[PDB]
Amino acid sequence: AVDTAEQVYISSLALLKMLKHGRAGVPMEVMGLMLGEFVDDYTVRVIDVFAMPQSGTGVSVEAVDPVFQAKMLDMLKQTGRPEMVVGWYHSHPGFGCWLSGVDINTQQSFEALSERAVAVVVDPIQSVKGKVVIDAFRLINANMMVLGHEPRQTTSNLGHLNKPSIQALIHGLNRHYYSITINYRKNELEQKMLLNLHKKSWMEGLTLQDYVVKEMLELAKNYNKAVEEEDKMTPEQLAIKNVGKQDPKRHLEEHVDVLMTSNIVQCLAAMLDTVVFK
């Protein structure tokens, strides 16, 4: 009846086992399970993610052991929070992380167990640092083809997620499926130390530790002189003369600005004499 676009709140702790357990299955595809709480129709949260045994014979719906979860939920009771299960996830490192033929067969089984059972995919390969990558989807019922086939209200959270549209075969699965919006509920307490732990460990280890003399400048002078004539022949090549040769051509970069910063490296590193000492 009434269906509203869902918003997925992921915890920074749940983001860990998505890429981490997925990295352990690389190259092969894994099968996980999502753990969280259903607040309402238009929003959903995943508060935890745990690792499930990887299948070396290929992913199947029987790869999830029911006594593995029954022993896990009991261990979650003695753990701080015993929250009910919600849905499943699987890695797909070998390709662009789209729902395979097994993923649709385990859909109607998991959506019978739990109401939503959001399908979540993840890939390591698409980037390293500055991209969300991952993936998510939710099955829209094929029996609804008799009814209105274009959910959801509050559109562009889908529509904008429908950008880039990610080639063809991916959105070729937009038949019988619709993706879901992933935003981050603020962990910033942990996220503030995530930046502090990362950059401090990357700043000279104490900031002190790190803080071929003339010879490095004799090797640099070959880049600061012998590179000049191959750079300064181009203005004489800009002289035609004049003018039979196709123009414009700009040879100014990148050596000029590199030798600039090359002195910026050597000047402030030589200031270590004046800085460290006295």
Q: Whole-number minimum distance, CB 217 to another protein, in Å?
A: 26
Helix (H) / strand (E) containing 233: helix 227-238
Nearest-5° angle of CA 96, CA 23, CA 200?
115
Going by C-alpha positions, the residue among 43, 146, 12, 34 that lies closest to residue 90 is 34
User: Would you say 161 or 217 has its CB closer to another protein?
Assistant: 161
Pick out residues in 97-116 that bind Zn ion (CB under 5 A).
100, 102-103
What gap in Å lies between CA 37 and CA 48, rounded to an integer? Answer: 10
By CB under 8 A, residue 128 contacts another protein: yes
Q: Which does 2 bind (CB under 5 to 8 A by kind): another protein, Zn ion, none?
A: another protein
Q: Whole-number minimum distance, CB 153 to another protein, in Å?
A: 5
Question: Pattern 28-67, binding to another protein, x per CB under 8 A?
Answer: -----------xx-xx-x----------------------
By CB under 8 A, residue 1 contacts another protein: yes
Three-state DSSP class for residue 139: strand
Scanning the structure block, which residue is given the tokens 């083809």? 145
Question: Pattern 81-100, binding to Zn ion, x per CB under 5 A?
Answer: -------------------x
By CB under 8 A, residue 156 contacts another protein: yes
Helix (H) / strand (E) containing 177: strand 177-178
Going by C-alpha positions, the residue among 3, 5, 8, 7 that lies closest to residue 18 is 8
User: Would you say 45 or 221 has its CB closer to another protein?
Assistant: 45
User: Would you say 111 or 123 has its CB closer to another protein?
Assistant: 123
Backbone dihedral region for residue 166 (phi beyond 0: left; psi -120 to 50: alpha; all else: beta): left
What gap in Å lies between CA 262 and CA 278, rounded to an integer? Answer: 25
Q: Whole-number minimum distance, CB 46 to another protein, in Å?
A: 13
Q: Which does 59 bind (CB under 5 to 8 A by kind): Zn ion, another protein, none?
A: Zn ion
By CB under 8 A, residue 262 contacts another protein: no
Dihedral sign, CA of 155, 149, 179, 184? Answer: positive
By CB under 8 A, residue 148 contacts another protein: yes
Which one of 81, 149, 175, 232 is in contact with another protein (CB under 8 A)? Answer: 149
| Range 148-155, long-range pairs (CB < 8 A, 24+ positions) | 151/3, 151/5, 151/178, 152/3, 152/4, 152/5, 152/6, 152/178, 153/3, 153/4, 153/5, 154/4, 154/5, 154/42, 155/5
Binding residues for Zn(2+): 90, 92, 103
Where along the sequence are the contacts to Zn ion (CB under 5 A)?
59, 100, 102-103
> Could you list the residues that contact another protein (CB under 8 A)?
1-4, 7, 9, 39-40, 42-43, 45, 125, 127-130, 148-151, 153-157, 159-160, 183, 185-186, 188
